[PDB]
Design a protein around this nucleic acid. Sequence first.
RNA 1: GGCGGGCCUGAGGCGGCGGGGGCGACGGGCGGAACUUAAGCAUAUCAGUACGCCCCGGAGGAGAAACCAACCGGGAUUCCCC
RNA 2: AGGGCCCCGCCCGAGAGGGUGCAAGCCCCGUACGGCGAGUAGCGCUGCUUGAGCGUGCAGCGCGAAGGGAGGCGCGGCCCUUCCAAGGCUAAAUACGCCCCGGGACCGAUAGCGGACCAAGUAGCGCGAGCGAACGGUGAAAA
RNA 3: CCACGCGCCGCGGCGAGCCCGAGGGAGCCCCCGCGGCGGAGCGAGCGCGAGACGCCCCGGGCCCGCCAUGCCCCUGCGGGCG
RNA 4: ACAGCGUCGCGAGGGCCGCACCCGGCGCUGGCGCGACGUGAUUUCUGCCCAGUGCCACGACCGUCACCGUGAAGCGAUCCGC
Lengths: 243, 84, 195, 201, 53
Amino acid sequence: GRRIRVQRKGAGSVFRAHVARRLGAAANDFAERTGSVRGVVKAILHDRGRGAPLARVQFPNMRGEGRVNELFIAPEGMYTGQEVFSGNKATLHIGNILPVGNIPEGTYVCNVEEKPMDRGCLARASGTYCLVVAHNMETNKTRIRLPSGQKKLISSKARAMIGLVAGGGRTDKPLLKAGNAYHKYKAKRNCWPVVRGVAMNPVDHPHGGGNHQHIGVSSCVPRNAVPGQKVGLIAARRTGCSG
Amino acid sequence: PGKVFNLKKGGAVVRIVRKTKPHQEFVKSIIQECTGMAPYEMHIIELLRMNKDRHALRYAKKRLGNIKRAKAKRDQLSVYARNI
Amino acid sequence: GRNVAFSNMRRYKCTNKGPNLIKNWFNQPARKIRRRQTRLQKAKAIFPCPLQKLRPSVTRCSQKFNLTQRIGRGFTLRELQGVGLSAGKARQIGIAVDPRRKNKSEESVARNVARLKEYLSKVTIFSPEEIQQAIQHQGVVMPVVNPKPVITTGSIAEAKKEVPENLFMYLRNARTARNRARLAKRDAEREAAAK
Amino acid sequence: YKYVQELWRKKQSEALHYLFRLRTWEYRQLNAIKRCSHPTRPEKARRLGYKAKRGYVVYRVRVRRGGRKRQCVHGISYGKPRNIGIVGLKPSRSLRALAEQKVGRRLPSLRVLNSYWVAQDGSYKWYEVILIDPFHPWIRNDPKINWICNPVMKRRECRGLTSAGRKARGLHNKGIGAMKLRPSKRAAWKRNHTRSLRRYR
Amino acid sequence: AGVQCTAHSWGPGRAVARLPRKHGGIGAYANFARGGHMAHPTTVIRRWCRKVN
RNA sequence: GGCGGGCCUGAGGCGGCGGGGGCGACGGGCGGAACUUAAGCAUAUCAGUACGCCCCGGAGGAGAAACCAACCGGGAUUCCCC
RNA sequence: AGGGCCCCGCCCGAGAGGGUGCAAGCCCCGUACGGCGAGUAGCGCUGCUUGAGCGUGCAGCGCGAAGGGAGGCGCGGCCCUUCCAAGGCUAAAUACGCCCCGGGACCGAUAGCGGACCAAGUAGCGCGAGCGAACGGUGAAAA
RNA sequence: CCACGCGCCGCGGCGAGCCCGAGGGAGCCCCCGCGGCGGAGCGAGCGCGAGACGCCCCGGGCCCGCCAUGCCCCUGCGGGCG
RNA sequence: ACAGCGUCGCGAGGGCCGCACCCGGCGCUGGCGCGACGUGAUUUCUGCCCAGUGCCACGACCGUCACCGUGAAGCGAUCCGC
């Protein structure tokens, strides 16, 4: 037999991310730890692959000279020229970044750092928001409702933008034609078209081929399966469409 | 058999020719008060003090190597538990 | 096939590849000529001196050959006291010295002490014409000859006091003694358990 | 140094365990092949054959503590069933030898003498090698060590002619059990497995 | 002798005889073929020396 | 607080002096097959072989006993005959 | 064209050979002949190896001595015989190509090296790693 | 075809012997030259250890071991004789 | 193949692959996301069955099932246990 498609995808050859012409990547300094750093939203631009609009904002170079440009997935409501403020004393508005503990209960968040000064981690996708819900002053950990709905505990000094990311409703649009997928996947990595494994001859895929094209033994594959064995639904608690 | 059987062996006369270096012991005592005991040994000295010596000849053979060198480790260690 | 005793040969290894394990002796005449010239050049380097050196007389090792004598590595320091010489002096007079060798018998020291005495008597030491006409020893110095055996013509009656009558029984009694006594411990031990 | 040989014999002692705890920590936060200003253990250096003469350099090489993993790709050895092993093979040569070979490659100009042991951590062992500069006038004009500048002794450690080599080849064992490895492991087999075909036969 | 050639048999269905054939299709490495290794080569191992008592 | 003086670890640069690569052999250290043989085939066998890798030298390796033996004993190594 | 025959001789410490226009000791070159000892040993558990078998040598990890090793069946107790591991050096006798020299009861151009040829690892062929041929003779003199 | 084991058969030398072993000899086809193998078996081993006959062959008879058995004994789980 | 339709894992101290190791891809990504699967635009729908075989449990520890550890023993290997 041969290494299946998932196995080859590890190499990074022909399956790498097409990150060219991308705008770029989207620090708790002392001045922003003590207070708040003012900024202006110079422009909002379209990144390749990322559905959400990014934004370039410039803040004074606290280090000593110049204006330092930043790139931030932008929340819905941004205006070029917006007085974005990031810091502990930043007021509650869309675009501002303040430590999650400061955020009042329920205020939507985006770009929540998992740990303090992680420079961005959760809720950065199109039209995805988080919900600040419970603050415990003891360990200073505020539960946020992650987009998936699973609730995690985020340290109070971890910060995030206020609002929900723009691009909201991007998926609720039927693509209609194969071409519109080709051109979404051209921007992203080479994963489309996807050939089914029932289609492949027995040598290439474990589902394989037989005189009648079936998946053979149950699709469910155990969590402890070897890298070639994990081809069907993995660790499936339940299968089937239900209620 | 490991020798040929000669009822008389010895038509020829045979040869009759066949220590601690105590200064080193003085080197050892100076090191012993600077270093202390070994942690395996401290367990053997405790085992001798509270629970027999059969266990403290088994724990020796296991933590060291052979019985001859273990029975020795018992003697050197025995002095500390019994003396106090 | 038929009644062939089984071949004990070993199947040929690395025949056409790897290590060259076939070493035909086509140089046997050539090597003998090469060794002769080299030996002759060594002899010339010290014309008075012998090419080889006096070696100790040693009993051949193991019971099968332990009644004859062969030449060995060197004379022991105790055997050097017999000629009254130190190890370094012995090298000067052509005596090889095995300081490791231990005589293992007082009798061993004496055959060796005699051999050492002869070398010291035979040798002549020079520190011009005499060196030119000295004539060096050719061959191993004093090669030890094991004598052929003899018959000693002793007396029958005197020898009969030495051996017990029915000699076979005496030899057998001590041959089986370890086993016969062992049975006695097993036998006595069996009796002790009951009565 | 007798009072320094005995002090070390008690390595498990707290005194030297504190020292070792700091020494393993520093070697860890330091490079692989580091040149040592002095032999970290002088007595062991002198026993192996280190004098403080110009032309004698000490270098410490860290080796990974571990069991061998074969180079077979994708984890599979495509031969007969006996050969199918990849994760549990154990090195042929002692880590000591490995440290010397790594130091010898890093400095090919210098010659390797013997190596001592300096410290150990569950992840890596640190053996300290003693190397000699074969060209310094002092070394060439010193009767005792002149044998290192003989060109037969080039790359002692690549040809396993050191002590670690003499332990792996098993040369250290003498007598019954080494009879079949003395001329060399390979040569002894060669001499035994040869058809002489003597001419007069 | 004759072994200093790379010849592998062409195989049936090519019409030509199946003997080791060099890349050219030229016969090679056969006791008969031109330039082939002799069927059993002469070797020094022969005992040129008999023995007499 | 700062600023020199040694000791000690570490930097740059110069001077001299070495290293590298080449040999279809022999010699050392390695990593290491499989066809083959077992009339099949798994241990075995080929074979501590090819091949890969790194090393010297005119030789190399080895070598002065933590040796053999059990005797009316030998006594570093290597090579030969058996 | 004799280095052929036929009569006769000469030299040999040289009658090995090669050349010369036919078979040459004596036609030429030659040849014989001259001269100037501690993270160790051990032990346990694995792998690797050996003929070494309750283990030949090795290694990983754990654990680690002081009088300690060996004696070819283990394990304890008692002796004996023999040696000092955990540091080094050291000629000799041994091996062997390229390279040069001699001899072959060797092959004599489909043979013998792939390659006896004025230009063979060449002409060529293959992207490449690589593969790899064929081809000697006029005569005494080009007359 | 050639080497190398092994089984026979013929022949040559020598015969309770026999042997160009490796080597060494101003030595190469000449001299000198050890193991080996045979001369005794049998038993797992401790061990024990062959004679009585005959052209030859074949059989018979006994003798040596290994395996039981009886008896007698001396230097006794040992020796002898059946 | 495809648009659509479902199923499934996963909150980064994480999923899933590379990979002798050193460690790399998705990821210049973050659940409107990355992967793994089926089915194959719409219109209309999608019955019943968990026996078996898969899978899943901040579902427990019933029994069985290792190395270490630890008990009892034996001089000591070792063995019985827990």
